Amino acid sequence: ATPADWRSQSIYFLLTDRFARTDGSTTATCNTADQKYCGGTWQGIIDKLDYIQGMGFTAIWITPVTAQLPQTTAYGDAYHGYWQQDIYSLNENYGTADDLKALSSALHERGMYLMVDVVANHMGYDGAGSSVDYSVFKPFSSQDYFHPFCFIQNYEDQTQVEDCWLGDNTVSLPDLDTTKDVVKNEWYDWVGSLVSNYSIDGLRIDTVKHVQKDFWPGYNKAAGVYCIGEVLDGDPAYTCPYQNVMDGVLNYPIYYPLLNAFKSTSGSMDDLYNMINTVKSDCPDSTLLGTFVENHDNPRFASYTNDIALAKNVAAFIILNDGIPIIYAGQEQHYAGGNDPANREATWLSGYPTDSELYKLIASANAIRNYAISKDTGFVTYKNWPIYKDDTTIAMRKGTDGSQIVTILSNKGASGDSYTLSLSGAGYTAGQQLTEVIGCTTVTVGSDGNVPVPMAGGLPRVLYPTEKLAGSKICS
Ligand SMILES: OC[C@H]1O[C@H](O[C@H]2[C@H](O)[C@@H](O)[C@@H](O)O[C@@H]2CO)[C@H](O)[C@@H](O)[C@@H]1O
Ligand SMILES: OC[C@H]1O[C@H](O[C@H]2[C@H](O)[C@@H](O)[C@@H](O)O[C@@H]2CO)[C@H](O)[C@@H](O)[C@@H]1O
Ligand SMILES: OC[C@H]1O[C@H](O[C@H]2[C@H](O)[C@@H](O)[C@H](O)O[C@@H]2CO)[C@H](O)[C@@H](O)[C@@H]1O
Ligand SMILES: OC[C@H]1O[C@H](O[C@H]2[C@H](O)[C@@H](O)[C@H](O)O[C@@H]2CO)[C@H](O)[C@@H](O)[C@@H]1O
Ligand SMILES: *[C@@H]1O[C@H](CO)[C@@H](O)[C@H](O)[C@H]1NC(C)=O
Ligand SMILES: [Ca+2]
């Protein structure tokens, strides 16, 4: 599916090993500190697609599928998919080629997309960089395919970031020489075949800053689908340029100030407001980036604060920002694990309740986004515009005039006082009736064109014209 196709999507990102087991248990042990396969599979995900679809998501992103190093290393098993050795086999822990194909079809049958995480940068090996037997790698079964062994020390030297190896002498990640034609040719061949074999709709590409930029166009082309790259850097001057070689990137620029704005009641609304504007202007296309505040490489949001209102506002932002919302499995159950491995908790241990507060909030937020898109072909290309901020508040506007979603977010938290925000710049017509679609309440624009927004318990407010809601199942 194309970049344009992907603009309208909303992604639930999950670790295949940690989302759903084949037997469907909600009690099977998964001690994250053990760093071992806990037994999630592709069949499991299939069985739990209603859970996922019930929150309004239209796609999933799953961790890599290629066959991994077999060992339990000092850092555990390759349960996460990022330590591959045979790219032409599948990781048997998750199922068979038939199961992965079944997952693709089940998603397609519900009108959903499959995104698959892929690594081009490295293989993985249990042991020191010097001890590597390159014959275990298929097809890269010689040292000739790799950069000389050295570790990345200096992250201000981009050449060294690209040419040296990630990992350490405990688990080394032999670095492919992606400057060689034979290496380019093999990966390009490989990614096209992967996509066609498994009917994959889009790719999330791991470790993109660790491969020289000229590698990526051929790879994005060979894939023939939207690719969104992980470029692990908050500076949009570093990260956004990668959009000149790949369709999109993960929104790490927005990540840091977004987290900071909502992780406590003294978070900076200003830094978030400014970065929205920076990315809107400076990045090639903010609407093909992936918005997130939680993943498997950083402490989860609730690790910073268990305030449910703060969690609700940050989730609402992720869904309503430019680009593709990305929610990481367990965020919706208010999971609070810290750095890897603590943030790879098993989703099944929650019992998958569909009435949890976050599940409901996410459902209502995706519900309005999905609906709005169905009525407004300009919604996804309209660049989210921040219209208001104060010390504890940010407001933003998205959608064609007359059909815009106006979102008001707060970091006052659950103890927040009640009061009325007089909101200017929302652009609704005087006396228009709006529905606040999270709490299903109605608001009437002033005769001065300001919107009197009732604020309470630090709760997020999401406004849309009530007339435009006619026929929908929203706020019935
Ligand atoms: O190899 C050490 C590190 O590997 C993996 O980290 C992934 C990371 O989580 C991905 O988003 C991306 O950065 O690529 C990395 C390696 O390709 C594991 O997930 C992690 O457990 C481990 O520490
Ligand atoms: O009205 C269409 C236009 O509106 C928005 O542009 C905003 C812009 O984001 C602000 O920075 C400021 O300049 O006001 C503009 C509206 O006058 C959308 O961002 C844009 O995509 C849309 O086409
Ligand atoms: O193997 C651990 C991670 O190493 C790198 O992460 C770097 C990151 O690029 C850099 O900006 C930060 O200053 O240091 C960390 C750790 O050295 C990889 O980019 C990550 O993918 C790995 O997870
Ligand atoms: O950790 C905060 C991030 O700071 C840097 O990115 C800065 C960048 O210098 C600038 O564009 C803007 O004013 O702030 C951003 C984000 O705060 C690093 O490059 C990121 O990796 C840091 O994490
Ligand atoms: C896809 O299937 C074909 C034929 O079954 C096979 O030759 C190829 O290696 C497969 N590609 C991948 C990436 O699995
Ligand atoms: Ca590299």
What does this 3D model show about the protein?
There is one protein chain. By secondary structure, this protein is α/β, with parallel strands linked by helices. The chain has two domains: 1-374, Alpha-Beta Barrel (TIM Barrel), CATH 3.20.20.80; 375-476, Golgi alpha-mannosidase II (Immunoglobulin-like), CATH 2.60.40.1180. The protein is built from 14 helices and 21 strands. The strands form five sheets. An eight-stranded parallel beta sheet has the order 11-10-9-5-2-1-13-12. Strand 15 (393-398) and strand 16 form a beta hairpin. Helix 10 runs antiparallel to helix 11 (269-282) and helix 13 (308-320) runs parallel beside helix 14. It is globular and about 75 Å long. The protein binds a molecule of 2 linked components (GLC-GLC) (2 copies), a molecule of 2 linked components (BGC-GLC) (2 copies), 2-acetamido-2-deoxy-beta-D-glucopyranose and calcium ion. A molecule of 2 linked components (GLC-GLC) is lined by residues 280, 382-383, 385.
